[PDB]
Amino acid sequence: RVSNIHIGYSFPEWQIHYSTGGPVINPGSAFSQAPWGSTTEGTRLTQGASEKAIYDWSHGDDQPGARETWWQNNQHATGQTDWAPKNAHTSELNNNVPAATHFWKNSYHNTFSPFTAVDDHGPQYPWGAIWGKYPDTTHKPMMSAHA
Amino acid sequence: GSGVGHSTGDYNNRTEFIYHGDEVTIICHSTRLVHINMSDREDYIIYETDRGPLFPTTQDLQGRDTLNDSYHAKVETPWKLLHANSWGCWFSPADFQQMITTCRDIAPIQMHQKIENIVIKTVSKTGTGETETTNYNNDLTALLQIAQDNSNLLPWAADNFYIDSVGYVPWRACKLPTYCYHVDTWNTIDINQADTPNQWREIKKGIQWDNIQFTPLETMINIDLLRTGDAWQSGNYTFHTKPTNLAYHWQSQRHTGSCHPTVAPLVERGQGTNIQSVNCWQWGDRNNPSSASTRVSNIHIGYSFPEWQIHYSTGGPVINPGSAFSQAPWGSTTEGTRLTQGASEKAIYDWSHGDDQPGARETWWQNNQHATGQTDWAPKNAHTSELNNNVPAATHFWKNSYHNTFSPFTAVDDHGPQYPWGAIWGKYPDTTHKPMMSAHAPFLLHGPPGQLFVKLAPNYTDTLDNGGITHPRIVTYGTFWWSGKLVFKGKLRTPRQWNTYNLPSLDKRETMKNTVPNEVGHFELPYMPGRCLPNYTL
Amino acid sequence: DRGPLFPTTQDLQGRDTLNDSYHAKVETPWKLLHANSWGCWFSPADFQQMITTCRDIAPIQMHQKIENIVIKTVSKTGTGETETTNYNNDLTALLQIAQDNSNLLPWAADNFYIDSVGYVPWRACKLPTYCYHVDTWNTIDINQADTPNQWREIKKGIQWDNIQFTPLETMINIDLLRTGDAWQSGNYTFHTKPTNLAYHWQSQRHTGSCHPTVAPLVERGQGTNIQSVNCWQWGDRNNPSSAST
Amino acid sequence: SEKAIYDWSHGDDQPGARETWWQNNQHATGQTDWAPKNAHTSELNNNVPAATHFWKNSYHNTFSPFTAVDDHGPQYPWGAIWGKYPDTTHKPMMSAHAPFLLHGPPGQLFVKLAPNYTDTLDNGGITHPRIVTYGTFWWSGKLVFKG
Amino acid sequence: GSGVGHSTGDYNNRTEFIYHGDEVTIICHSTRLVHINMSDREDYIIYETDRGPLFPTTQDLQGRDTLNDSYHAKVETPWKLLHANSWGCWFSPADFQQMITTCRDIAPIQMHQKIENIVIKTVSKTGTGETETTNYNNDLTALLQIAQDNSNLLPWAADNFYIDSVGYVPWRACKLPTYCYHVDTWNTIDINQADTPNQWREIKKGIQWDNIQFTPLETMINIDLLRTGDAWQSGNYTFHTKPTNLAYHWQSQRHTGSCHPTVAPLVERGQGTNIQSVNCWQWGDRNNPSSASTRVSNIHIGYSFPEWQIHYSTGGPVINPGSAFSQAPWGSTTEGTRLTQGASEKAIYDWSHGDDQPGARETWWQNNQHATGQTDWAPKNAHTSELNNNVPAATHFWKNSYHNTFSPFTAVDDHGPQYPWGAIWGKYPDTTHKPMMSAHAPFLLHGPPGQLFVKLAPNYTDTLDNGGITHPRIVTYGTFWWSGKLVFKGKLRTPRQWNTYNLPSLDKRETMKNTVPNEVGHFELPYMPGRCLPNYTL
């Protein structure tokens, strides 16, 4: 049914950009893999632009001389979850059900469009950065991937 | 005076066009009689739904059939929702033609609305058997209760996406849809599986109860109780938005800018020749040939998108729309082969909304046929590795791909207003990134016009026991008169060309006699696009 | 016509169809004069002066003039071999000038064909003729269901029903000038943003805090990345914690 | 990358021929992202991906809300200084050639010689000869920049 | 400054639409380049003319062929006449569409005009044989002489009935017709004779010399001599007239008033039945049946006239027009059988006026096809002696008569404006009884806009002898730029109906591509009627 906007967008993930400085990750949008069966214990699905913090005794860690890891799947954001292997597209949208041909299951594409409403990570305690810096470029980013 | 026997309002449904230099002010009046009856229950309820019709129970279509899922979970309220959001509510067919002929762009300015001439009465069946007699007699002391939600505390259900609104025809009575809104539920269908391909399976299905949000209207907003002699005023509402363009754009990326230098033809019906060697900016490392196909440009008009993109979300599968464009250049026609590819859309509507006969639903499929400059259809595009004087090889050329070419350079354009059935306005989501443009309603609002809820207060019998088991109530219905005024402003249109235009008419699929009433009074409102006249983009 | 090097055959199976210049225009008797280009306003040393000494720049205001108008006619009396031509003034003759301020006419001065006033100040210049596109469908199908590795044209031609034809005479006021009078543009003020005159060399791995390392002890020695550090990593990954992720 | 084709009237050495200058944009190395060289993998964790779950050769559009990017900038001699926005609901975010996009661009200036007819113009349309005429005028302009 | 090398004017040809509430102000600018050359002679002359082509020299068609007489007698003057009277002069096709779409009625308000940028030059042929060379070189001292006739002392020749006016296309050069006017002559042809029937004979033919009136312009009005550096102003002219209605009327005498009482149909596609016994005013002594055919009415719409009425006058045979109406209800069609009966008219026009190709003349026959309410065609009417409950006998009924039913009761309606070629205004005759309405031009004026005369002063050689035999003069021609501004005012039109209109377009006989220029630049202006939209009369 028609709608004015779309919530979320697929992105090739994890996108490895080989740049002039070296390979990097190009992030996708933040979302929870919980609707798809992800859990901290058991099978972990990293797909949601999840991130891990590595920290030591000086920053919020229990014992000296070791580093502790906290992996945050962003588990409360379930409305934004769009994961490209699960999406499909068909050629014609009508009263007929598509054929085996004219249906494409497995593609990875970037659906970010003028219609997409999306949402960022937000503040992460303790370890998240509060602020960040814009680059000076003709096109500034629309939103931040961490801070 | 005021009381039982004095009328609280009058009937005004008519439009006004105020012309001053380079400015048009349209004042739309709409008055409708609304037939309301007692709620199915006095309680809020929350329930899951079935999948829907034509959802697969088997693997035989191997998942391609799962687009049919309507499954969801809602909280249904005793309240009814009354909104005017649609074009056919405010305009008659001749008023909308007047607007789209004489105006360049338009925006809504301010709005207010009223409810008055409230009548409530009860049904008493004394028939006691065959040849049964019913009596309809007033309850002078009885309450219609009205709640306007100004601060938008309640979830937004009035988007006109189910075309449930006040009627289009002024002299007919109307009925309101029941208000209800979604609750959090996971619906995740896996059509692509590692172990077992060509299968579909549901991973997580059900209501998520832990964080569920349940909001009654009683706790959120003040409710006004009205009797037969008093009336209700909305107050003024002011839109904050941008005008929408009433002209369609025919120019593609090769219809804009300076055209390639040519040698004019000497005779009649002769064609010019492109000069081979010219000064040009070319893309890539290419001088030969320097052609209009490859030359630099500041912008690009249109973008490809995977279409139709089926997004399997936490709530279920959805369509992720592409840009609106006409498939006519590729041979699409309403009759014959239909190409749905342009982000086309169909309206389903009934006798209450612009339909000819009662008891049936009519369908209007709009291919957006005037927008031919924006048309970009991914199977037809290609890409090559090197752009130079050489023609690419079989390798280094990719024909069939589906990609999203939306970039910083793309200039694109929306659907625009659709008469009768299109929504006038819509609501932004609150997210860090707001959408750049709307896929249906021409105007997205941060605060949209407040939602207006209407309900009949219950009339109990004498047997209410406080225990909960027996709370009968006497059958009751009511009617009230809804008035509203919406003001638009726009820019006056003047001829930019020598030759005559094609002024907005009736789509070839419609004829004039089906627009006017019948021997029995049946007629349907015609379709008109909000953009019926061409103009230059750049 | 299509243009040079457009395929007439299927031998290159559609890959050759990028060469299409086909279009449809309305050509006007008017000539177009614009200064839009960098080489018009700056000399090579002036542009070097600017890009050396400035961070960013934007245009502010502009005006222009036309004057010292001379019009004359050609008279060939030669009547055969050893032909003589005479160039003599018409004192009463008109140059007509139209400035389009409200942008009612289609926009043809983009400098994409590099047709502009000359770059060299001491040389004479000639203007391109003004013309603009009309609505036409050109749709080539290089990807077909029935017959692959083919190309076919679906819709080709001018769309006459809604066509727009705008003369300058009806849209804008035209000024007629004789040899003694001159023409002024009036002032024009740009509204825009500055553009940055510095290029950026930093990639996504040249920005931000660099990975912690152990500095080299000797000359031409290279530092070593510390294996275990505090970091924010993408995904569920501590090992290795690298500048890549 | 883009190439300019220009003649003696515009910055060219010899008359009667056209010269070509291909500009690879060679100073902008930080922005370089070339799709055949990028890759994406399914899971990002301490494990190295398998042969499956790694996709080398794809071509996708990674433009996202997070991307900071940068345009061509001014090109001497031949680059356009300004350009025109299209009127559409979504205006482009940045220009692919001219450094400055304008809503109203500088007005277009049109020039024509009025016709000088002979005495034989017949009003019928068949014969309207006109005497061969040419002209010269001097164009002056002043453009002000600030930076 | 001013002199040889300074231009005296600028080119403005464009229209402006000023909208204020219920009022429209249209300001039309028109500027044209006029090519003028030396007069055929510097003297006035007076001469008779031949009959014309296809006039009978024999009795074989027994007089029916004598309608072809063009015979007359004129006084031809060296002056040329320049008038803007026509619709196609002031409006472009899109401007006229804008007007007739958005306005109810309109009238011209004020007008002024100019002449400037005067160039005069001479032709010198030195070729002296084959391969001849001509030189075109300025005479800086030479005179264009201009005479505006404000008081209307000269006979009125600018009626645009020969469609000789300033050109319709702004970018093309124009040429003026020579001014000349009739002198008194008797032409009387007798097609009905007592002695010898089925013959034709001329009684009195020739110029009547005794009372003849000969008026030069030199004696009547002041003449302005202009050189290349000076320019000419008209002064302001103000029209005094009434607006003309831009809506056509479809209602006949049986489409007006209260309709006969009927019983509505119960089903779909059923038709109602007229109630047999009703209260009515009937004509005559008649109650049975009381039918919509016979019932009283205050007025009558339309009148029959003998048509085509050929009036044999003292000047020759003429057509006496009937009222304008459509023959479409009777089965007339442009293709197929054409019925000319409605006071229809044809325009003959050339490349200079709205025609596609040079060297040929194109014809447009306008049946007035939107006016169907006024249609009264005498062969179809009948009359009977008694009007009562009895049906008339074979006697007392007259079928085939041709009579003029114009009466005090008749309401009738004129042609209205015809684009491009119709005259805007006309001139009243001075007679004791002025006509009630016009047969062509929408506006009849007492003082019409003054006639403007233009002439090149003669350039003699040195051989002028004062004896009259030798007065050679050097071949000279000129060009000047004519500017004018005509202001119109009218009433804004608003929708009176629910359903959409048919907005003014292009006649089925025209297509859009013939309106726009060609590969070689050939195009023709489309026909539009000034009344393209319906409205209720009474």
Author numbering:
A (entry chain P): 326 to 472
B (entry chain D), E (entry chain M): 32 to 569
C (entry chain N): 81 to 325
D (entry chain N): 375 to 521
Task: Provide the authors' original text about this structure.
In 2016, CuV was found in human fecal samples and cutaneous T-cell lymphomas (CTCL). In the CuV capsid, the depression at the 2-fold (blue to cyan colors, corresponding to a distance of <110 Å from the center of the capsid) is broad, continuous, and has a slight diagonal tilt relative to the icosahedral 2-fold axes. While CuV’s VR1 is extended compared to MVMp due to a five amino acid insertion, VR3 is one amino acid shorter and adopts a different conformation. The absence of this loop separates the 3-fold protrusions in the CuV capsid while the loop merges the 3-fold protrusions in MVMp as well as protoparvoviruses CPV, FPV, PPV, H1-PV, and LuIII, which all share this loop. In contrast to TuV, the two highest signals showed glycans with α2-6-linked SIA in a 6’SLN (N-acetylneuraminic acid-α2-6-galactose-β1-4-N-acetyl- glucosamine) context. In contrast, CuV possesses a lysine in the same position (K377), which is similar to the CPV variant (R377K) unable to bind SIA. Thus, while TuV might bind SIA in a similar way to MVM or CPV, CuV’s SIA binding is likely different due to sequence and structural variability in the capsid’s surface loops.
